[PDB]
Design a protein around this nucleic acid. Structure first.
Lengths: 80, 93, 104, 96, 96, 80, 104, 93
DNA sequence: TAATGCTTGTGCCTTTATTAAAGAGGAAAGTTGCGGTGGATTAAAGCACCATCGTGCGGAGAATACGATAAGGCTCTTGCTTCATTTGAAGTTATTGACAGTTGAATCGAGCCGCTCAATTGGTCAATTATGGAGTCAATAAAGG
DNA sequence: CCTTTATTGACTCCATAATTGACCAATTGAGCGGCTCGATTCAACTGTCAATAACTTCAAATGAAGCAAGAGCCTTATCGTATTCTCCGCACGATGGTGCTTTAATCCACCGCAACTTTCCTCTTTAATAAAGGCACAAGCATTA
């Protein structure tokens, strides 16, 4: 798969900013917000994959993602 | 097979707090996750407490100190009161 | 057979809590009153969260607790907010707030 | 015809999206992004649907919190428009 | 006579205190403050000397880090003078 | 043993700011910097005292302070 | 007898690490190679930190490693800095840095 | 009583790396604290990994996965290489 | 630029105290052997993930007019820095004493371990009611006048 | 303030699907007993924390003067916003295929338990030398001209 970071469209970033209470958004933000998002995913998915590699599985489950989030102090309820 | 969840017990608690209010399945899962997370935090704190003093036993004192260290303020005070009440009732029975 | 939860007057499963503590290998030996104390603390916390969530649901003219009401109850309470500051509630949204500068 | 002053519809959107709980990012683009990122760590990975849902929930929550901090930083500098330097400052103070 | 411009001695002090590793708060006032604070939690508490030393080390490290974040926040708002609002913003973003 | 918070003098706060790279300091800062400091101590000492109360001791040790700092993500080396 | 540390070619105490792991009750059983792997990892990390600290000490024309040199080595390295971001080192000070804005 | 530290082993490693450089007592204490902290982190991560898969034992694979999850990037890569080398040498002898 | 004041960087004596080195013991690691549990292997089947297709429709992309927000420039006044003097409170050293942390024993309370029973809970099916989609109306707020 | 127009809360209806209740099983918690550990209490040793005094002298307090930076005000230009049109690919519904995840049975292999040995590490002591203090001193930086 290639170039799917652009799939996070400008309206989606605008909606995420509005949910956070942002009133005006600069033009450059949509680029930076993408890169930041990528970094976050790189930090979580990696950890999740590690768990998947330790269980000798080839399917990444929700429990791996939950443990990976918990490792970074980002506890998530509703998928336990 | 069998998933170990507090789904009944929390429900019971709800029926003693809000008799006319129900709870959804997603909220049920969130409450179960919250209870599990708090249990793990308290258990790990009690384990560290026992290790620090070189004690092989976790007693009500260890759980009380873990509650004091984890839960903040009035939450900790009320939780300690409830735990002491329950332990006294269990011993007296 | 008086269950250990009825002896302490708790709705939570003291026996299941004892089994979980034993299976978790948190210590070599487990005291008699430790699972009772843990069950009481868990029951109190669940009762507090459910009371606040039910108040939030009633304030919204609803008779069923949804993740939104749990999120509102958690974030509107000082001590529960402190306890679960770093916790994400799925399908809960965010607490409605707007900075005073942004208002017209 | 009728035209709304700039910022009125922005405030309406702020009120609307803070009241809802739905996901704001489309599911398929996020799934494709997650698969593309994961392909760099292990080849031929299958993703459970709940795993992708949890990843989307976590990412959206993180971005909303980051935008709250960014808005605080922008308001601190006597502005209402958030800029990339606001995000950079928020991420630096957060320790990222 | 010689008079240094405002900020020259400030920069010299910044360079001097960043290279040293000594404690900056006097020991006795900090010890008295620690005892006064602890007397509210439990009456008749004795303190080891190393305990007070560790408390002072931790407090000084925390204050230095907080002042670094405050300086970042102040520079963000196009200023060089840190203000209480800078500390408030830094503590808010840090999650305190 | 009252108002010992004023023992954190203005020169001490100035030196702590200089170590952090601060060039100019507002007049009000010395007050605010005190209060937050107090809060920090209130968060650590409490926990330390809790440990001291669990060991049935009346002397607060350095190890208790190290544990209290570790609980708040403020790990300290050199006293372990 | 031939020591396990010597057998694995390590300077760290594989036997003491085994004793610590068994006393910590981290698991019901402990593998044969787990303490060896842990000792190797700890030895590598100690060697890295000590090498960087010795470089820092020799930079300042010193023949002794002090906490200042450890602090400089840890904060000047990206991986070590990431690993120990939330760690305060006593008698270490801070990295000498000044914002470019403040300079005259 | 007698306390247990890594002082001798840290000194051995230092003399192997920097033959002509010594270490102060305070720096040696800091290094000992660092070693203890890393050991605790790795052991706790290995315990969690064993618990997640319902495995009652900790093997070299658990420690390797804990190293990957805890140590970052090239540090983790080199640590894994060193651990694998040591385990192979231990097994072959 | 340039002299000049100044703070800091640098070379060398002293000592010292902070680390390098040695010894007894005693505590912990290595070795041996056995048993029984846990990990590795293979089969199997069901359950879930990936790929495909239709479609049709709401959301994304692009243009456009624009107005208001961000940035640059100017001033002024006031808040903070630098230096000088006085002092008062922290730092150091020596001393006392009494409180409390630690270690050692005895011991009785208490929790671990096995085996049995059955009572509680979890999976599955049926359903009804709180809730969601949809349409419609009135109340509310905003923008131009 | 007025008046028109866009937006949203509320009301009601129809559907709907999602939570609640009932039932079989299955499994695990309670009970009983025996047994070995541990944590409680007591006491003595001594480690050291708190209090004391005195001397010193260096850093904190205060003030004066100086000066530059933060904030308010003004202008402008440009760039994100609100609206409209076109299109496009997301999502829902159905399907097929397959691979891979969990469960079960088997076997072997590897680690815990226990006892003996032995040797390596950790207080106690002695020494020695790298660096802090002190002194003197050169050199680059800032400051006004």
């Amino acid at each position: 798969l290639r170039d799917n970071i652009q799939g996070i469209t400008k309206p989606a970033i605008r909606r995420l900013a509005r949910r956070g209470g942002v009133k005006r958004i600069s033009g450059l933000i949509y680029e930076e917000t993408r890169g930041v998002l990528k970094i976050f995913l790189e930090n979580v998915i990696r950890d999740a994959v590690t768990y998947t590699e330790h269980a000798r599985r080839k399917t990444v489950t929700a429990m791996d993602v939950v443990y990976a989030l918990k490792r970074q102090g980002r506890t998530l309820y509703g998928f336990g | 097979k069998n998933v170990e969840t507090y789904k009944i017990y929390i429900f019971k608690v709800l029926k003693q707090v809000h008799p006319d209010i129900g709870i959804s399945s997603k909220a049920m899962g969130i409450m179960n996750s919250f209870i599990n997370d708090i249990f793990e935090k308290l258990a790990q704190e009690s384990s560290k407490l026992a290790r620090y003093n070189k004690k092989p036993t976790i007693t009500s004192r260890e759980i009380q100190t873990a509650v004091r260290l984890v839960l903040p303020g009035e939450l900790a005070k009320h939780a300690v009161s409830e735990g002491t009440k329950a332990v006294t009732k269990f011993t007296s029975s | 057979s008086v269950s250990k939860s009825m002896k302490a007057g708790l709705q939570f499963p003291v026996g299941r809590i004892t089994r979980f503590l034993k299976k978790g290998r948190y210590a070599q030996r487990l005291g008699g009153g430790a699972p009772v104390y843990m069950a009481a603390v868990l029951e109190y916390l669940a009762a507090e969260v459910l009371e606040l969530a039910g108040n939030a649901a009633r304030d919204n003219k609803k008779s069923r607790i949804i993740p939104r009401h749990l999120l509102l109850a958690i974030r509107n309470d000082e001590e529960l907010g402190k306890l679960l500051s770093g916790v994400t509630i799925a399908h809960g949204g965010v607490l409605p707030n707007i900075n005073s500068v942004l208002l017209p | 015809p009728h035209r709304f002053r700039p910022g009125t519809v922005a405030l309406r959107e702020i009120r609307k999206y803070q009241k809802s709980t739905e996901l704001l990012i489309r599911k398929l683009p996020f799934q494709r992004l997650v698969r593309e990122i994961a392909q760099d760590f292990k080849t031929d990975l299958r993703f459970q649907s709940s795993a992708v849902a949890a990843l989307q929930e976590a990412a959206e929550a993180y971005l909303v919190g980051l935008f709250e901090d960014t808005n605080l930083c922008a308001i601190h500098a006597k502005r209402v428009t958030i800029m990339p330097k606001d995000i950079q400052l928020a991420r630096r103070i957060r320790g990222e």
